[PDB]
Amino acid sequence: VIHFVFVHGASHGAWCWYKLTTLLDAAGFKSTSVDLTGAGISLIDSNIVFDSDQYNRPLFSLLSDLPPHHKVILVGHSIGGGSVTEALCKFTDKISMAIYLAASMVQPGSIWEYTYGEGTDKPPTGVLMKPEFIRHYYYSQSPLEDVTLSSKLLRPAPMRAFQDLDKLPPNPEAEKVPRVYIKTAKDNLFDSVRQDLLVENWPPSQLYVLEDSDHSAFFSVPTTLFAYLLRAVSFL
Amino acid sequence: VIHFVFVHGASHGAWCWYKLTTLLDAAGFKSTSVDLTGAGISLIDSNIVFDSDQYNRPLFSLLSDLPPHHKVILVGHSIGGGSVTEALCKFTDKISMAIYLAASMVQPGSIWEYTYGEGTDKPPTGVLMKPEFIRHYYYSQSPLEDVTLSSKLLRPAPMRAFQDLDKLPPNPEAEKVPRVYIKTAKDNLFDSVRQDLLVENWPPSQLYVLEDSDHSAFFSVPTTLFAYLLRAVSFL
Amino acid sequence: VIHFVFVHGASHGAWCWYKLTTLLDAAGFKSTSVDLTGAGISLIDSNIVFDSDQYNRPLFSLLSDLPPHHKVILVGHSIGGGSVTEALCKFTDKISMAIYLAASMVQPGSIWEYTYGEGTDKPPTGVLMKPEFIRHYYYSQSPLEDVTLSSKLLRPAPMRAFQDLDKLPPNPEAEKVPRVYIKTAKDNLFDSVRQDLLVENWPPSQLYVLEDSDHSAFFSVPTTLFAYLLRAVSFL
Amino acid sequence: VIHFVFVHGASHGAWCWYKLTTLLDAAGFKSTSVDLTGAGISLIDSNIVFDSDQYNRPLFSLLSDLPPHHKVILVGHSIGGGSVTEALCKFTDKISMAIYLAASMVQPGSIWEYTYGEGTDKPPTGVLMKPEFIRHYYYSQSPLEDVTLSSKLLRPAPMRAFQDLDKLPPNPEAEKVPRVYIKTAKDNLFDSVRQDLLVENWPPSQLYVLEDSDHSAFFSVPTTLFAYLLRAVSFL
């Protein structure tokens, strides 16, 4: 049985994958959606999450607890791509494929509201997109109800933790694991040029393009996204 | 402009009204969905919420900050009806109508996993329905993706706080506010008869019956629920 | 009970309202969707429909067979708006309200494939949009499955019948009936300026703007459209 | 590129496969959905289709127009299985695989409304399920809007033509072609036990079971069906 592990992006949570994993369940796949520390329904305030290793703990903890022979397919969205690659490097033997959905894919070896949990003279501890802008940047092609939903679940993102993502030494063993990049074509937040550049600097085994997706493929085009995942899996 | 305030039930949060408030937006209404303490994306652990007033703070706070002339229509689901009735008594002048959706409506004057936040020899501090039972009890008539959604969002409910709900002295002023009860007919958790019984013991201005709804009307029959709200609004 | 009657536009049929009437059914309204002659699953070839009254036969028959006191709300799409105005002129006593959804509403008194069922030297008998263009013009904001659906149901439209539409003598009785126009904001086929002009030249009781609708509001923004119809109903 | 050919069942048309072919498009497959004579948007009245080869004409013509080396995967639903088996025997060289979805698959060598197009003393020319029974029998597990859609698209079926389907002489060449049966588990029309019998009497290369599907898998469980098709293609 093939096991997906989904890693959300900044300010989001496991909740954002609800349409997608429901399909995969029905297709006989197992999916696990994590809440990174300070995200989703995590009891920890993201404003006290200053570390990459602390942010990724629920994901790393999950990969550690896998039985000796079990492997998973990692799927990351946006900044979640950083966590996927980091997890790709620490648990390489347990990853069969890494998928980057409009995500930060960086080879190992390479408007906003702010929260000042340590006072204003210190750099900000949390960042959150202002409510009046979330539709255009995150959900520009998504059903309106998903915007309502997101507006009640989005949490500030731990800025301090993001500064340490993807500062990794070259990893020849992780290079052997097949990667898949899925590009979002109508993404107002992660520009097409910036996505093409990630692909060019570290070409993946497969590349898909969601012609109609905004930043949030899991809301705007879940069935199409679903199809591409099964197709990437047929590859093995 | 008519202003609705939605109060979720046990283990749920503001997120559960995402389908309903979107319709109401299109209908020219304003809606506010609250996260009661320890629910939704509240940073406070529900296991330390031992008090009714502590649980209701986000709701009571919102009603306080209402402009001198502004009134709202309260809509409560399930145990949320208890918070509605209490808020109906403390902010009577600020409530134009109280709506009870498969909710506890008690006249002023009248399977589970447990968490032991004060050790196992003290009574439990939190209660949560086991994952294998939520589909049948909460969402038996709901889309599967809404079950998935809920499973990544349900948080333990503050049991101790619920013991104080609806222990209110008679309030003749609160009797003057028009009430509406909306009954869910295929509710596997709050049996149909008990709902009828609440209505009988304290007759509302109106009674609607969602013939096809499970416990979670906002997932299973949001458009019909939407329509009934519009009908209830037509009165005042 | 409030009764809606839906009249499709060129090449479409009753089938296109499937999302909308399902919502309306659940809200306790009655809806009837007709197939105009040569459309939907009509057994008659549209290339032999040369007459306005022939095309409208199914709509006219339904209004005729209406009980003495029963009224209906007419909702027309696109060229179907012409049929709405015509039926408004022949059955005023039976129409409580006429709604024009991105439809031709003209006051009484005021790329394509062609089929030549009568040879090439005679004027064309049928018109149908080329398959490669239906997505962009008809369904630019609509789900892909609906484009697929439409591609297996779209039939050529009877051009000859369209020339007699909205060629009506002034009707002061039809003027008393409340009209509502719903403008589609992202319509690649029926331009914004042209919609405003219909509104300017014959001001309706109400004006709605679907900020996110393509030409096919019933596919791209069905719930929002549903909400707007209930609103228009709230008046009379 | 792999080409699917979809054959609807009695009263249905190409329109019924709209969700499924959209998914397959996304997986990079080509699909063609046919309207058998008198079905879908066929201009021919089914009450004058008394003949099997006339009913199968749109399908047979399609297989005829296939380029010399090109093959297709035949997928039939319900009575469409008869057309599939028949096409399997007549165009064996053009079929790479035949798939039976809750369909009649019989080895070569082995409540209703009626229409009387030839008067009442002659046997009926058309059959159609009464409107009040289509939900339970066809769409017991399908979205309500698909029931609405179907109700405006279902056409009477040519009873007379059905008497000649699958009256075929043994075909050792057709036996070499790999078959797939996909069983519907919650089918109120083609009971689970009877489906098992077809498999027993003529064992397929593969057998899939849609645990949650009604008679109309293409409406009720499209993504799951989609997945099984991908699995079936994996057999090459």
Curated annotation (Swiss-Prot), chains A, B, C, D:
Pathway listed: Plant hormone biosynthesis; Lipid metabolism; oxylipin biosynthesis; Porphyrin-containing compound metabolism; chlorophyll degradation
GO cellular component labels: cytoplasm
Residues at the active site: S78, D187, H215
InterPro entries: AB_hydrolase_1, AB_hydrolase_fold, MES/HNL
Segment forming the signal sequence: none
GO terms for biological process, alphabetical: chlorophyll a catabolic process; chlorophyll catabolic process; leaf senescence; oxylipin biosynthetic process
Gene3D superfamilies per record: alpha/beta hydrolase (3.40.50.1820)
Subcellular location, record wording: Cytoplasm
Family classification: Belongs to the AB hydrolase superfamily. Methylesterase family.
Function description: Involved in the chlorophyll breakdown by its action in fluorescent chlorophyll catabolites (FCCs) demethylation. Demethylates the C13(2)-carboxymethyl group present at the isocyclic ring of chlorophyll. Uses primary fluorescent dioxobilin-type chlorophyll catabolite (pFDCC) as substrate to produce O13(4)-desmethyl pFDCC. Also able to catalyze pheophorbides in vitro. Methylesterase shown to have carboxylesterase activity, methyl indole-3-acetic acid (MeIAA) esterase activity and methyl jasmonate (MeJA) esterase activity in vitro.
Protein name stated in the entry: pFDCC methylesterase MES16
Organism of origin: Arabidopsis thaliana
Primary gene name: MES16
